[PDB]
Amino acid sequence: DILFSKLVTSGLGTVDADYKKCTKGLSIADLACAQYYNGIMVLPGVADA
Amino acid sequence: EYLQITSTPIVVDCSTYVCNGNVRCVELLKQYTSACKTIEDALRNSAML
Amino acid sequence: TKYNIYDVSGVGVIRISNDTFLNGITYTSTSGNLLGFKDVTNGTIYSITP
Amino acid sequence: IANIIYCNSVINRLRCDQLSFDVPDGFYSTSPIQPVELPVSIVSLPVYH
Numbered sequence: 001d002i003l004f005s006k007l008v009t010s011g012l013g014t015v016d017a018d019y020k021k022c023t024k025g026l027s028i029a030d031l032a033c034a035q036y037y038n039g040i041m042v043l044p045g046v047a048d049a
Numbered sequence: 050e051y052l053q054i055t056s057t058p059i060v061v062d063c064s065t066y067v068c069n070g071n072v073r074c075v076e077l078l079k080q081y082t083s084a085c086k087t088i089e090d091a092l093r094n095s096a097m098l
Numbered sequence: 099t100k101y102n103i104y105d106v107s108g109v110g111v112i113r114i115s116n117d118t119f120l121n122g123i124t125y126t127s128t129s130g131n132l133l134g135f136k137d138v139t140n141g142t143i144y145s146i147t148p
Numbered sequence: 149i150a151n152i153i154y155c156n157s158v159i160n161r162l163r164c165d166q167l168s169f170d171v172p173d174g175f176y177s178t179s180p181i182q183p184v185e186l187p188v189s190i191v192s193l194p195v196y197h
């Protein structure tokens with residue numbers, strides 16, 4: 001957890017999007033949902049925690 | 050010692066990225082028969098492997 | 099629906115957000131596509147989805 | 149002409165888009181068809197006109 005928090009959080013990096021929330025429109029799309037509208041789909045990490 | 054073992058796989062839908070969902074655009078895209086198929090196959094196979 | 103919102107043309111779906119942004123009237127993503135807009139007469143903010 | 153397939157079903161449309169009679173196992177991207185009765189929505193600021 002130190003090596004996963006002490007280093008810069010990848011909020012602007014490759015984080016998969018909650019596709020179930022991106023099409024609801026209940027809030028303006030974040031960086032993850034905005035990329036989904038352009039066909040870019042970041043798949044879930046194979047290294048499951 | 051630190052060794053990288055994985056990289057977040059990314060897949061892109063060729064039709065949505067270039068045509069932005071425009072119906073007339075996707076008909077023109079079909080002329081580039083090998084363009085979308087080559088890009089999508091390269092990304093999908095790397096993610097599966 | 100086809101929309102022309104504040105000199106921006108596109109096709110999408112418009113809904114009502116519980117976002118309360120205070121600045122501006124149009125919100126765009128990095129690609130330039132319109133993500134939402136604000137009605138000046140009432141202050142409600144709407145979202146846009148393909 | 150030796151054999152043909154009609155691009156009518158879900159699996160056949162994927163084959164026609166992939167330009168192959170055999171589809172390797174995996175995950176394939178796709179997009180639903182767009183409606184045609186699209187209304188017009190206009191928003192514009194009131195100014196000296």
Ligand SMILES: *[C@@H]1O[C@H](CO)[C@@H](O)[C@H](O)[C@H]1NC(C)=O
Binds near residue numbers: 026027116117
């Ligand atoms: C907006 O609505 C969403 C979904 O109900 C909720 O998760 C979020 O906390 C709400 N935020 C505000 C500002 O009410």
Ligand SMILES: *[C@@H]1O[C@H](CO)[C@@H](O)[C@H](O)[C@H]1NC(C)=O
Binds near residue numbers: 137140
């Ligand atoms: C105006 O804003 C109020 C805020 O409570 C909301 O109830 C109402 O439906 C909005 N109406 C329009 C036409 O924007």
